[PDB]
Each structure stands twice: as structure tokens, then as C-alpha cells.
């Protein structure tokens with residue numbers, strides 16, 4: 580089993596997507612951060628398991644799938660055979676987790692990352708115990724149509740200076756943004 584983390588990149592107005600896409604111009608260093616965080620395993624030899632919705636999966640340039648050095652798991656109610664390149668296809672979130680309990684995935688998985696979308700987040704956030712949130716805050720407003728569930732600052736404790744996370748303000752093409760990490764442990 581192990582560790583359960585969610586990583587999101589959100590506009591000032593809580594927008595995460597637009598048109599089966601990202602609302603802002605591509606920020607490589609975020610994408611190189613999303614990549615590094617998801618990939619980095621604690622214990623040597625173990626890999627990270629990343630879970631995403633269907634639409635999220637097909638939004639990675641066909642090029643990029645699966646996301647190398649991680650187990651690619653995709654949720655769908657509808658598909659019957661895992662997507663081309665995915666390694667696991669599950670029907671519910673809870674099955675995805677139930678998957679990692681399996682002694683055959685017990686030794687090979689480290690951290691689980693909920694990399695989106697929009698509903699995985701929400702039931703992933705209502706799930707008891709410990710959960711860490713890795714929020715990139717674009718310090719601007721974007722025109723979005725799918726949004727991130729509000730952080731319950733009295734349920735979620737925003738951690739000041741965490742390991743391997745550059746706590747300061749960034750800029751890529753005039754867009755300023757920072758790396759945050761919220762925790763909950765009830």
C-alpha cells in the first residue's frame with residue numbers, strides 16, 4: 580500500500596481545466612515538477628502508482644503515455660479493456676486503492692498519487708486518514724470549466740517549507756506561481 584497524495588495546478592479562481600485542456604500556456608517547470616514528484620520513490624526499487632480519470636489520461640500527448648517510471652492506472656465506468664498503454668483500468672477509485680493492498684502490489688508500489696481529474700480529487704479528499712495535497716497556485720485567473728474543490732483550511736493544514744519543494748514564487752512567461760503542500764491527518 581503506502582502513501583496517498585494528490586497533486587493539482589490551479590488558477591487564482593480555482594480553475595483546473597478548459598476544453599479537455601489546461602487553461603494557461605504550458606509551464607515546463609511545473610510539468611518538470613509534476614514529473615519529479617510523481618516519479619520519486621522513497622525506498623530504492625519501488626515505483627510510484629498514479630491514478631487518473633479517463634479524460635485526464637487522453638490529455639497527455641499520445642507521445643507521453645504511459646508516464647515512464649510510474650504505474651499508470653485509469654478509472655472508467657465504461658471502457659472494458661485498459662486504454663492503449665495504460666497498465667491497469669479500474670471501475671472505482673476504491674478498487675484502485677484495494678489494488679495496492681494486494682501483496683503483489685504491496686511490495687512493488689511506494690506512493691500513490693491522485694493526479695486528477697475533478698471527481699477523483701473530491702472522493703480522494705473525503706477519504707479518511709492521512710492525505711497530502713500538492714497545490715501549484717498560478718497567481719492569475721484563467722477561464723476554466725472544471726474546478727478544484729475548495730481547500731478546507733480548518734481540515735487542511737498548509738505546511739510551511741516541506742522537503743524537496745521550492746517554497747518560492749516562480750515565473751515562466753509572465754505567469755507567477757508557487758508550490759504549496761497541505762496536509763490533513765484525521
Ligand SMILES: NC(=O)C1=CN([C@@H]2O[C@H](COP(=O)(O)OP(=O)(O)OC[C@H]3O[C@@H](n4cnc5c(N)ncnc54)[C@H](OP(=O)(O)O)[C@@H]3O)[C@@H](O)[C@H]2O)C=CC1
Nearest residue numbers: 588596597599600632633634635654655656657695696697
Ligand atoms: N491543471 C491540472 O492540474 C489538471 C488539469 N486537468 C484538466 O481538466 C480536465 C479533466 O477533466 P475531468 O472532467 O475532471 O475528467 P476526468 O479525466 O476525471 O475524466 C472523468 C472520466 O473518467 C472516469 N472517471 C473519473 N473519475 C472516476 C471515478 N471516480 N470512478 C470511475 N470512473 C471515473 C469516468 O469515465 P468513463 O465515462 O470513461 O467511464 C468520467 O467520465 C481536462 O481539461 C484536463 O486537461 C485534469 C487534471 C489535473
Ligand SMILES: Nc1nc(N)c2nc(CNc3ccc(C(=O)N[C@@H](CCCNC(=O)c4ccccc4C(=O)O)C(=O)O)cc3)cnc2n1
Nearest residue numbers: 586587588607610611613614638639643646647694695715
Ligand atoms: N501540478 C500538476 N498537477 C497535475 N495533476 C497536472 N496534471 C496535468 C494533466 N495534463 C498533463 C499533461 C502532460 C503531462 C506530461 O507530459 N507529463 C510527463 C512529463 C511532462 C514533462 N515536460 C515537458 O514539458 C517537456 C520536457 C522536455 C522537452 C519538451 C517538453 C515539452 O512539453 O514541450 C511526465 O513524465 O510526468 C502530464 C499531465 C498537467 N499538469 C499538472 N500539474
